[PDB]
């Protein structure tokens, strides 16, 4: 049952807990994704990133999320566009049939961020959609963030607050910055969005490692770092990572025990299970659990 | 673009070519095989076991579809319903909109198939959907066969002949019984569907033990068995087992060569194009493309 993304954020904003943004590239994920809302009685923010979109193709990505909608009439479900890189490609997501689309011009200085920022606001909303941007520099200045929210007039800002990611990557550990986040909370007064923040749970990592898989590369950041951001006023976190690795975690699993399987649904039924239960406990983490 | 499953056979049957039945269990298979039937301009006749449609739930299985068909409007589909086991499961079917239906009683004596078998007739003819059925008994009598199709008035017929399957499995290598094939279908003269005839490809085989699988037990048979029915006049030829292979053999492989991998679109998209080719080469084989 799809919703404007910001009815769903801001409830979120106002009542201070956060719903995780669960992206999905198959029916594999959105199933998952589906059933684990259902089981924790929490809203629904559905992402597709460029390349999902690219994979599937945007009449599928729709029309799937559509076609679970009515399974699951019960459960408020905002379709964002994860990253959208150009004016154009938001606008197809809109016309597609999105409630939400974010465009990332966070690479680019202040005033071409706002500029292309404001176009994407302005066609989407005409259209009853809500719009995520992104501002950083570095971590990103309060009276800034500000500023950029007043005149593109944004629903969601996903601010550099500690997370190496995107045009913000830097070398070290990554750490929340919660009177910056807090401050610009106060300034800007909207849905906040976590970006980069990957937890890798423990028990999802040792059984990514238990199947043979090698995480060096792929840290996350405690579960306190979610918790803590989600104090300081987001309302939105992005959740992609953790849902791959217990998701292929079990692919790799059943790969190993029987060299003869070749029974799809042998493979990505505990796939999915795994990738559920991550959902699941992301959601009571963040407390969009027994929201609906 | 769905079509009922008779309109597709019956055109094989009249010109003597085969069209093969492609199953699909989720998006990944289905995108495949709609890829292959527009690359080799060929009819599809998409399949769903009881067992994709309980994973995939009705609901997904034929929206997928039909977001698939619009995709390519110019080629014909029929979604059948792979070996129902119950009227009722069939009736689901088509009350989902399944364009053809198989219902398999042959491991029932001749009066108990023909009666379930009549009775399903009744239901989908009256909503205009195509009907299977399977007949045997050890190898079909040709004037049994004759008999059942007469009196049941289905649509495309099974019979047993010398393929190990379903109820009338067997020890040795099986041999196709040619001139038994050609009295059924002399008696019958409706199209003809083959059962449990897994021809896995050299490349597809090697592929699936390169990447460490284990194939003790799926032998299979030759090229030239499926040819020779297809000369016989059988006219539909179940194909699951050659495209499950050739899909997890390449998620074997992703999974084998980089344990950091946990991309699903990196698993999958090669899992595709294995697939796709696997039912591009079985259309041309049995003689289903260029016929759109
Ligand atoms: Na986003
Ligand atoms: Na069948
Ligand atoms: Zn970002
Ligand atoms: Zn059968």
Redesign the interface.
């Known amino acids: 049952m799809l919703v404007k993304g910001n009815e769903i954020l801001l409830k979120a904003h106002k009542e201070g807990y956060g719903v995780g943004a669960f992206n999905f590239?198959?029916?594999?994920?959105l199933?998952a994704i589906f059933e684990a809302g259902n089981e924790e009685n929490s809203p629904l923010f559905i992402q597709a990133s460029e390349?999902?979109i690219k994979?599937?193709?945007i009449?599928?990505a729709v029309?799937?999320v559509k076609?679970?909608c009515?399974?699951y009439p019960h459960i408020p479900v905002a379709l964002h566009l994860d990253h959208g890189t150009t004016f154009e490609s938001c606008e197809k997501a809109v016309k597609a049939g999105f409630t939400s689309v974010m465009i990332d011009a966070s690479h680019h200085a202040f005033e071409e961020n706002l500029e292309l920022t404001s176009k994407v606001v302005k066609m989407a909303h005409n259209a009853g959609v809500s719009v995520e941007a992104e501002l950083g520099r570095v971590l990103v200045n309060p009276k800034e963030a500000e500023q950029f929210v007043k005149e593109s007039q944004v629903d969601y800002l996903a601010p550099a607050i500690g997370t190496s990611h995107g045009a913000f990557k830097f070398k070290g550990e990554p750490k929340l910055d919660f009177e910056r986040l807090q401050e610009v909370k106060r300034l800007t007064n909207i849905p906040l969005v976590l970006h980069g923040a990957s937890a890798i749970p423990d028990n999802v990592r040792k059984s990514?490692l238990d199947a043979?898989?090698?995480?060096?590369?792929?840290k996350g950041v405690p579960f306190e770092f979610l918790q803590e951001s989600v104090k300081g006023g987001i309302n939105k976190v992005n959740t992609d990572?953790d849902l791959?690795?217990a998701?292929?975690?079990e692919?790799?699993k059943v790969?190993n025990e029987d060299?003869?399987?070749?029974?799809?649904?042998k493979?990505?039924?505990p796939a999915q299970l795994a990738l559920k239960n991550v959902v699941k406990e992301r959601m009571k983490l963040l407390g969009s659990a027994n929201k609906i």
């Open positions: 590239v198959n029916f594999e994920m199933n390349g999902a994979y599937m193709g009449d599928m029309g799937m076609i679970m009515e399974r990514y043979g898989g090698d995480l060096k590369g792929s990572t791959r690795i998701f292929i975690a692919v790799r790969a060299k003869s399987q070749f029974d799809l649904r493979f990505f039924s």
